[PDB]
Amino acid sequence: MRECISIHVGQAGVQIGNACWELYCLEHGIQPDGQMPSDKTIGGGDDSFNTFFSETGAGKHVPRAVFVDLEPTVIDEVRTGTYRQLFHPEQLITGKEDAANNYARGHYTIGKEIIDLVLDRIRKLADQCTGLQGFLVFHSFGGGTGSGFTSLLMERLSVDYGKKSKLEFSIYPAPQVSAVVEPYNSILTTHTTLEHSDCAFMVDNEAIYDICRRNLDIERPTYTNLNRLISQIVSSITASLRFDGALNVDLTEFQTNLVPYPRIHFPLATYAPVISAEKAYHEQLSVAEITNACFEPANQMVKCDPRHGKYMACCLLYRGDVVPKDVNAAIATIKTKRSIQFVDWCPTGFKVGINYQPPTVVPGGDLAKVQRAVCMLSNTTAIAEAWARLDHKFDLMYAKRAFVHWYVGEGMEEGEFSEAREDMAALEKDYEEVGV
Amino acid sequence: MREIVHIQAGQCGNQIGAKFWEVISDEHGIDPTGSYHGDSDLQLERINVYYNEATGNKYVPRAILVDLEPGTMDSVRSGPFGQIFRPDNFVFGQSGAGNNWAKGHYTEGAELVDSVLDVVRKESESCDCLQGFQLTHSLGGGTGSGMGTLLISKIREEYPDRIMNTFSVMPSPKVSDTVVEPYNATLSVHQLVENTDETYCIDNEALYDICFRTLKLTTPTYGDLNHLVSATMSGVTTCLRFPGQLNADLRKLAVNMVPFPRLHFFMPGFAPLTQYRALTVPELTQQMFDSKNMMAACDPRHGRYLTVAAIFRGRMSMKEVDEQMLNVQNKNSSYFVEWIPNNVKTAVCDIPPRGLKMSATFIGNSTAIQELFKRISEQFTAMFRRKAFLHWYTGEGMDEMEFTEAESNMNDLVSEYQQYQDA
Amino acid sequence: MEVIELNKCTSGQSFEVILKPPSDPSLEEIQKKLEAAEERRKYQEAELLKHLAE
Amino acid sequence: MYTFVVRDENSSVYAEVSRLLLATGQWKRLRKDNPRFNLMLGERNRLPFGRLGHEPGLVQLVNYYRGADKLCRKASLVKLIKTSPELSESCTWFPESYVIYPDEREVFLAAYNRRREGGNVWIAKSISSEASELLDFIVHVIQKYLEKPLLLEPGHRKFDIRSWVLVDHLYNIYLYREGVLRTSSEPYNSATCHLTNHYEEGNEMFFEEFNQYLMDALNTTLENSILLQIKHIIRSCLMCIEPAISTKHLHYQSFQLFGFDFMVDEELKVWLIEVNGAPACAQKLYAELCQGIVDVAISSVFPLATSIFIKLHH
Numbered sequence A: 001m002r003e004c005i006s007i008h009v010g011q012a013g014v015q016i017g018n019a020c021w022e023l024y025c026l027e028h029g030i031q032p033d034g035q036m037p038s039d040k041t042i043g044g045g046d047d048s049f050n051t052f053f054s055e056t057g058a059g060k061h062v063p064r065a066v067f068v069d070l071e072p073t074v075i076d077e078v079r080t081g082t083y084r085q086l087f088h089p090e091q092l093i094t095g096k097e098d099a100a101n102n103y104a105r106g107h108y109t110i111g112k113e114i115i116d117l118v119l120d121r122i123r124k125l126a127d128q129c130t131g132l133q134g135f136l137v138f139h140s141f142g143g144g145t146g147s148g149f150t151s152l153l154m155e156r157l158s159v160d161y162g163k164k165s166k167l168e169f170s171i172y173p174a175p176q177v178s179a180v181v182e183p184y185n186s187i188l189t190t191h192t193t194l195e196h197s198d199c200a201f202m203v204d205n206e207a208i209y210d211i212c213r214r215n216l217d218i219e220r221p222t223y224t225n226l227n228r229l230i231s232q233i234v235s236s237i238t239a240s241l242r243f244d245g246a247l248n249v250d251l252t253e254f255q256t257n258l259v260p261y262p263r264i265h266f267p268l269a270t271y272a273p274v275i276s277a278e279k280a281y282h283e284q285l286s287v288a289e290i291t292n293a294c295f296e297p298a299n300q301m302v303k304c305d306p307r308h309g310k311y312m313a314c315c316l317l318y319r320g321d322v323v324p325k326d327v328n329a330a331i332a333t334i335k336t337k338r339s340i341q342f343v344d345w346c347p348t349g350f351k352v353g354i355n356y357q358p359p360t361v362v363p364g365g366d367l368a369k370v371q372r373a374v375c376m377l378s379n380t381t382a383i384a385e386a387w388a389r390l391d392h393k394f395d396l397m398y399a400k401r402a403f404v405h406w407y408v409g410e411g412m413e414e415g416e417f418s419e420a421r422e423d424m425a426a427l428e429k430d431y432e433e434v435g436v
Numbered sequence B: 001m002r003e004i005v006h007i008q009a010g011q012c013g014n015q016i017g018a019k020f021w022e023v024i025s026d027e028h029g030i031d032p033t034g035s036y037h038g039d040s041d042l043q044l045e046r047i048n049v050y051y052n053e054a055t056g057n058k059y060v061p062r063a064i065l066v067d068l069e070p071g072t073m074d075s076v077r078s079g080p081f082g083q084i085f086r087p088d089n090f091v092f093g094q095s096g097a098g099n100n101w102a103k104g105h106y107t108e109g110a111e112l113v114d115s116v117l118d119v120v121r122k123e124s125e126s127c128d129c130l131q132g133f134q135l136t137h138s139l140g141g142g143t144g145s146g147m148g149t150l151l152i153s154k155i156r157e158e159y160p161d162r163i164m165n166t167f168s169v170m171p172s173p174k175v176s177d178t179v180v181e182p183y184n185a186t187l188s189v190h191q192l193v194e195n196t197d198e199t200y201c202i203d204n205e206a207l208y209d210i211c212f213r214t215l216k217l218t219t220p221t222y223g224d225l226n227h228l229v230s231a232t233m234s235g236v237t238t239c240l241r242f243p244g245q246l247n248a249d250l251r252k253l254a255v256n257m258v259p260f261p262r263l264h265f266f267m268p269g270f271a272p273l274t275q276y277r278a279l280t281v282p283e284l285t286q287q288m289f290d291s292k293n294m295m296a297a298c299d300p301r302h303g304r305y306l307t308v309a310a311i312f313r314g315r316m317s318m319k320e321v322d323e324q325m326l327n328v329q330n331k332n333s334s335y336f337v338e339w340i341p342n343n344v345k346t347a348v349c350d351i352p353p354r355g356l357k358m359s360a361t362f363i364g365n366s367t368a369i370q371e372l373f374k375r376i377s378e379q380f381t382a383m384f385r386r387k388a389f390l391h392w393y394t395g396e397g398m399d400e401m402e403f404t405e406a407e408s409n410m411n412d413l414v415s416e417y418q419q420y421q422d423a
Numbered sequence C: 001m002e003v004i005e006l007n008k009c010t011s012g013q014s015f016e017v018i019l020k021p022p023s024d025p026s027l028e029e030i031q032k033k034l035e036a037a038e039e040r041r042k043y044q045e046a047e048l049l050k051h052l053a054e
Numbered sequence D: 001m002y003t004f005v006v007r008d009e010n011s012s013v014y015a016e017v018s019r020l021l022l023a024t025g026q027w028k029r030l031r032k033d034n035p036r037f038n039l040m041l042g043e044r045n046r047l048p049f050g051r052l053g054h055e056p057g058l059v060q061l062v063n064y065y066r067g068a069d070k071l072c073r074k075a076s077l078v079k080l081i082k083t084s085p086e087l088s089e090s091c092t093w094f095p096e097s098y099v100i101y102p103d104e105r106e107v108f109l110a111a112y113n114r115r116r117e118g119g120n121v122w123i124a125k126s127i128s129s130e131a132s133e134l135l136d137f138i139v140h141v142i143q144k145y146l147e148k149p150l151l152l153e154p155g156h157r158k159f160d161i162r163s164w165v166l167v168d169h170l171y172n173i174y175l176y177r178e179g180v181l182r183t184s185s186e187p188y189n190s191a192t193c194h195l196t197n198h199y200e201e202g203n204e205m206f207f208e209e210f211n212q213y214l215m216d217a218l219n220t221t222l223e224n225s226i227l228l229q230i231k232h233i234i235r236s237c238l239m240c241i242e243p244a245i246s247t248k249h250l251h252y253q254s255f256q257l258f259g260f261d262f263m264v265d266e267e268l269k270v271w272l273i274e275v276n277g278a279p280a281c282a283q284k285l286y287a288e289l290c291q292g293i294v295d296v297a298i299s300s301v302f303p304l305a306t307s308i309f310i311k312l313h314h
């Protein structure tokens, strides 16, 4: 049993982390007080869920998590939330004042003063692991902490935990639910984090927002709406790590199955079905139907057109009443009716994983309980559209040096901007070559 | 705790300041004696930003009242809510500043500034995490203008890494006390260009024109003008005083509103300009961007918006808010710079101000503000060409060269706006 | 269409369908960057306090 | 009110639709780089489809289908027809073509050999009688030259049929009822008169006159003898790539105007020559066709305060 340590950085990382661990507890039968009757190895055991939960002598299942934020507002809600009993103080870390949406501030000014403390709290979680396999890092691109402190942390994690895998769940900036400097922070943190992340799942808030309005009929979705949908998608991605199974059982497999080229380590995520809970009667979508939905852009975590890119790897994670027979029939039929071009140097195929437990939903939530869902992780060059959009907005402001003085004033130098941008230009080139 | 330290200097500063505390004290349910009698917890969540917890569940405004004459500060102490201020936080002299920037900044003002900095220190030392300072003052007089900026300079020296915001009242011949106001304002603007992060530009000419034309107030008073200012001040600080995090703290909002350090002068706006009928969201939006509702006597259709921040208060539909907000700009995107994507941010707050089902406050960083500085510069130069009234300042030890430098500095500011208005 | 590596357990199963065959910085280096950023801040503050002292 | 942006000053057609859009007092021409637009009349090459449909509150429509180039390039068109099960082995209206880079450089000579054993003239571009001459000239595609085309009389001259087809955001296929022939005006010499690219005003003949000629010279009609074949080739080509270019459930909308170029042989059989993605129009027809573009393609998505098209159903 290899342990996984989760790290939540900034408001988006912390609030998303809260939603995930609430879902994890419901999925594993863990009450808010931190104990699960089903567990018969009191105070120990090395089951699949133990990769995410430690155990105390009192039968308490404590998440292998650390919450880090430079102001205490958001993390205080963890200390007083419905699941306050799960965590102990050592794993909740808050500073005095935040990075004010300034990468340079979170990375340099404030980051340098707190980085050692965070590493200490993480060390106390690592020391508690018999075979730590790596970290899952949640954060926003746009926040000053999520962007600035995360990249510093990722740098140090590569130093202190060289042999360990690191995955990201990254919130890509969307003007519908946002700060004007978020493109700067996005490029800065991507450049600095690129060579330290083995596999990164980008979630564009624009897509989550539109799925909440379109499928859930939420007129003006809030972070709580957005986070409970993101947690479902995070859960189905981390499900293989905390349940019995054969696909994606350790962090390394994510890299092996989804990332042939290291720099192109941003798989696209598509989820289905998202169904409103107000709809008492709703027809249960079939295997073929939800598998087909995995190729509709309206269900992707990032709005882009895979029809005009090329696939490097494609992985299908099903939850619920699914049998391999239906999947293959669904895949056979979809192949002849959609545009699915793989790169020449990769096999055209699908790695399929089925977990029989149907997706869990938060009681009193917006998502309807369904009998079967799927999350498709596909590494497609089409996701380079998101880099192009972000790089364009960066170019518009940086041509006038707008806002640059805020970063220089914090210790950064203009050189880091153009340097980070040139890396993004080479990143777009890398997708261009693979996708010709 | 994100505490803010409020300073109000001079006659105008203390009169704008006094009504600000009267207004927000009401919104937060704080009676004239500091006792809370509010019917909602939202009032007390962020009460620490502007008030201190005192023994007996008393809330004492974290404000410092400053003036070189007593009187404006005696009236405050005798007016409505005058009992709510800490007595130690009244810092005043006896000489006055004679509407003279030099007296407030160099002679009379220097004598008293250390006493103010002692109170400021005492307030800051008991802040869990000082967020920054906000100053209310006029630029046309002597104490708020000359000493107010001397304060800002001293505060920056001692708290160099804290935010400094001002609500600054610009002078106008149409509402003028003395003929030297262009000198005092020109001298103050240079201080503000250097030492503030955000200056809310309140133009007494716009305030007057609104009372005369829109409010149809034949012969307005300073009370009428200050009614619009306190309503504006209440709106801009709404996101600082109630749950919500879009421009949540002073630094965050400065980062999103100021793309160039010297261009941090904002055009205020409010709607509805203040009977029993509530405006619809379309009506709020159209009025808020209307020139007539602008409080800086500048036409934004003569310049381009660098950034814009709009705050809506009252229970309304965020959908219609977006529909109209996105509507007004998509219909006039000729007045927004295209090199700052998504430069219009909207905030919403459930608690409406006193006596209004819903309102909207406007904070714009527009290059049209150069018109206001052009006005001042032309009036300054009209007199300076003839060294008129200059003896009032040289008698306080100032040299003419200091005026020349101020003139050059503001002309530089004006050209720095025109540069970005054509880019 | 070939199914391969079909693994089965009590909580689900997994397999692979093939439709077509194919045709670091040091801890010291980081401190140098961080201390360098701090230095540039301290310098900008020094110029400010010198400007104010004037 | 709606807002659009122009990004191809050279487009003859869309310079006119932009003039009509303004002539309605309900469209505003924005700076070419302003992203707060409703409609993009985009550039011909490197159009940034990836930056469309991401502006909040903006329904965005563009006048090009991303991926329509596979149909509008000489090589990819040959590749599409041959490798598309919807068209391959069933394409009796597209002359056998071959793609050879300066790849099927061998398969060409295969069928070419049988020809000389048994008509064996070919043409290549992107007109000679032997493969050696063609390859010395030369990515280029080569297809059998239609040695026996229908010749108009008098003049004994070959013609060129151009049809304009409009595809709206719903992927309806609209055929402009007005087409044009491009006549060589030079007697066809079996051994300038071979090319028809730009007796009758402007060296172009419209449908009303061509139909009368057929009724007089051949006792048939334009509809029966040729138009049925035109509509069939248009529907086949466009339905074939619909799954690959449709903006049905996309975060932005597409429409596009196409120029199909056909040719007719002695047996009144219609052949597809090529498809243009950025066609111009006949001066006598810019007005009607450009207004129709606004009616069915633009104001259909952005409404305002008979039909010149034939809806090819599917």
Ligand SMILES: Nc1nc2c(ncn2[C@@H]2O[C@H](COP(=O)(O)OP(=O)(O)OP(=O)(O)O)[C@@H](O)[C@H]2O)c(=O)[nH]1
Pocket: A009, A010, A011, A012, A013, A015, A016, A069, A070, A071, A098, A099, A100, A101, A102, A106, A140, A141, A142, A143, A144, A145, A146, A147, A171, A172, A173, A174, A177, A178, A179, A182, A205, A223, A226, A227, A230
């Ligand atoms: N989906 C989702 N996005 C969030 C959430 N919170 C913030 N964001 C997004 O994150 C970006 C802002 O960054 P934050 O995470 O709030 O900032 P931070 O990491 O705490 O950094 P600082 O506040 O500057 O110290 C915006 O684009 C928000 O839309 C959340 O709870 N859920």
Ligand SMILES: Nc1ncnc2c1ncn2[C@@H]1O[C@H](COP(=O)(O)OP(=O)(O)CP(=O)(O)O)[C@@H](O)[C@H]1O
Pocket: D095, D123, D125, D126, D143, D144, D145, D146, D147, D159, D160, D194, D195, D196, D197, D261, D263, D273, D274, D276
């Ligand atoms: N296989 C063929 N047989 C006979 N004639 C042919 C032919 N292919 C092309 N032509 C002739 O060549 C001329 C040009 O056709 P082509 O489409 O290749 O030019 P083009 O595409 O470069 C410019 P346009 O977009 O106006 O068509 C046409 O007028 C046609 O008569």
Ligand SMILES: Nc1nc2c(ncn2[C@@H]2O[C@H](COP(=O)(O)OP(=O)(O)O)[C@@H](O)[C@H]2O)c(=O)[nH]1
Pocket: B009, B010, B011, B012, B013, B015, B016, B097, B098, B099, B100, B138, B139, B140, B141, B142, B143, B144, B145, B169, B170, B171, B172, B175, B176, B177, B181, B204, B207, B222, B223, B225, B226, B229
């Ligand atoms: N809006 C407003 N403006 C004022 C008020 N009092 C003075 N002013 C303006 O402020 C300038 C005079 O400065 P003042 O504050 O009286 O001088 P000080 O006491 O030395 O700071 C002139 O431009 C006046 O028009 C007031 O109560 N409200």
Ligand SMILES: Nc1nc(NC2CC2)cc(-c2cccc(Cl)c2Cl)n1
Pocket: B134, B165, B166, B167, B198, B199, B200, B236, B237, B239, B240, B246, B247, B250, B253, B254, B257, B266, B309, B310, B311, B347, B363
């Ligand atoms: N940029 C910005 N934004 C703010 N909030 C609303 C956007 C939501 C409030 C303020 C502010 C705060 C204190 C003093 C002064 Cl003068 C200002 Cl102008 N500034």
Ligand SMILES: [Ca+2]
Pocket: A039, A040, A041, A042, A043, A044, A045, A046, A055
């Ligand atoms: Ca156990």
Ligand SMILES: [Ca+2]
Pocket: B111
């Ligand atoms: Ca004295």
Ligand SMILES: [Ca+2]
Pocket: B114
């Ligand atoms: Ca002293």
Ligand SMILES: [Mg+2]
Pocket: A010, A011, A071, A098, A143, A145
């Ligand atoms: Mg934060």
Ligand SMILES: [Mg+2]
Pocket: B011, B012, B141, B177
């Ligand atoms: Mg006065």
Ligand SMILES: [Mg+2]
Pocket: D274, D275, D276
């Ligand atoms: Mg052509």
